Amino acid sequence: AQNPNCNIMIFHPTKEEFNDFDKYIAYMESQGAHRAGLAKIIPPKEWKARETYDNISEILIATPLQQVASGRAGVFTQYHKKKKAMTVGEYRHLANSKKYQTPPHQNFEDLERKYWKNRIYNSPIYGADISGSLFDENTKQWNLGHLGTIQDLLEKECGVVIEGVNTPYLYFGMWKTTFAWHTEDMDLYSINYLHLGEPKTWYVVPPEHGQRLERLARELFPGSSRGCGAFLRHKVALISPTVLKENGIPFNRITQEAGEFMVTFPYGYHAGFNHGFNCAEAINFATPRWIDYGKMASQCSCGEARVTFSMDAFVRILQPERYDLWKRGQD
Numbered sequence: 569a570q571n572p573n574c575n576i577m578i579f580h581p582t583k584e585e586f587n588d589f590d591k592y593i594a595y596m597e598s599q600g601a602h603r604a605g606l607a608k609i610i611p612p613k614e615w616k617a618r619e620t621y622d623n624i625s626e627i628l629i630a631t632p633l634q635q636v637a638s639g640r641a642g643v644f645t646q647y648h649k650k651k652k653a654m655t656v657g658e659y660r661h662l663a664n665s666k667k668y669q670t671p672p673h674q675n676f677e678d679l680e681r682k683y684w685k686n687r688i689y690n691s692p693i694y695g696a697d698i699s700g701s702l703f704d705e706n707t708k709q710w711n712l713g714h715l716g717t718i719q720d721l722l723e724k725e726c727g728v729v730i731e732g733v734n735t736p737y738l739y740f741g742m743w744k745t746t747f748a749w750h751t752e753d754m755d756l757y758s759i760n761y762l763h764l765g766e767p768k769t770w771y772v773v774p775p776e777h778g779q780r781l782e783r784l785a786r787e788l789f790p791g792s793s794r795g796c797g798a799f800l801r802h803k804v805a806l807i808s809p810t811v812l813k814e815n816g817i818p819f820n821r822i823t824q825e826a827g828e829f830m831v832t833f834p835y836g837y838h839a840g841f842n843h844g845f846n847c848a849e850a851i852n853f854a855t856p857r858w859i860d861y862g863k864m865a866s867q868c869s870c871g872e873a874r875v876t877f878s879m880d881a882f883v884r885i886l887q888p889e890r891y892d893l894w895k896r897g898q899d
């Protein structure tokens with residue numbers, strides 16, 4: 569078995585190997601990359617996502633989210649308070665302000681220490697989940713707006729045509745902006761490109777050990793667990809690496825820098841934080857190997873998780889027994 573310790577693997581494809589996206593995901597899996605739940609892909613030196621980022625300031629962040637924490641430094645939840653709209657140029661200025669800017673630090677490990685010590689005492693503002701793309705239309709390789717759709721994959725594998733669409737999302741971050749522990753909708757893959765700015769630190773649990781994280785989460789968030797049998801679908805719970813290590817949960821960590829892709833694999837729980845002002849683009853995708861994960865994915869039906877239009881078909885076709893209850897939670 570390849571990669572039996574479930575380490576995060578880093579790949580350096582050549583420009584020739586960068587042509588065929590599906591083929592390269594399958595290659596990475598042949599080497600055991602999925603066992604980690606996360607892989608890094610460094611693009612060939614010839615590649616670029618677009619020519620410059622000099623003209624992005626007028627993008628609108630319609631609903632910036634202030635991420636307010638509750639709990640203790642290593643075990644906390646966050647809620648999202650909606651703020652008034654602002655442009656990316658306005659948000660960048662805010663991120664660089666004395667109130668929100670990255671503190672002085674020695675290296676990524678010192679900054680990680682500072683994040684876990686101090687995150688809860690601040691409420692950073694995240695420009696998350698903005699439909700759109702920063703890839704140039706002429707970028708033909710690993711263009712996250714030109715991927716094969718999940719609806720087409722399900723139709724190719726299973727023979728059933730379904731409604732729905734699959735488009736990318738932009739994320740504008742600042743110091744301490746946080747992504748809570750989660751897997752993707754329907755335990756899909758994700759791919760995330762860090763277009764510009766400061767790094768993003770990731771934590772990930774191997775897919776084979778995801779249920780260990782779920783059991784710890786039920787223990788640490790006992791009210792939430794009584795409320796919902798899949799409450800990590802709410803995307804609000806944080807657990808620090810120190811707490812994971814104290815509880816014997818297998819995990820890994822890595823820092824993504826601008827110009828790098830990350831892929832999350834089906835049922836790979838992940839969480840993390842931004843180091844400072846940045847912009848990422850991400851989208852879900854599927855492969856044939858996903859189908860079995862999609863069939864087994866947990867679902868939130870309590871009403872909290874509320875998701876896209878396109879998840880309806882995935883539940884309806886892959887999980888017909890669960891459909892009626894899940895749809896009630898959507899309505």
Ligand SMILES: O=C(O)CNC(=O)C(=O)O
Pocket residue numbers: 739746747758759760832838848850851
């Ligand atoms: O970058 C973020 O805030 C969160 N991204 C992801 O969870 C992802 O790409 O799957």
Ligand SMILES: [Mg+2]
Pocket residue numbers: 623624625626627
């Ligand atoms: Mg602009």
Ligand code: NI
Pocket residue numbers: 750751752758832838
């Ligand atoms: Ni994710």
Ligand SMILES: [Zn+2]
Pocket residue numbers: 795796797798799801802868869870871872873
């Ligand atoms: Zn729920």
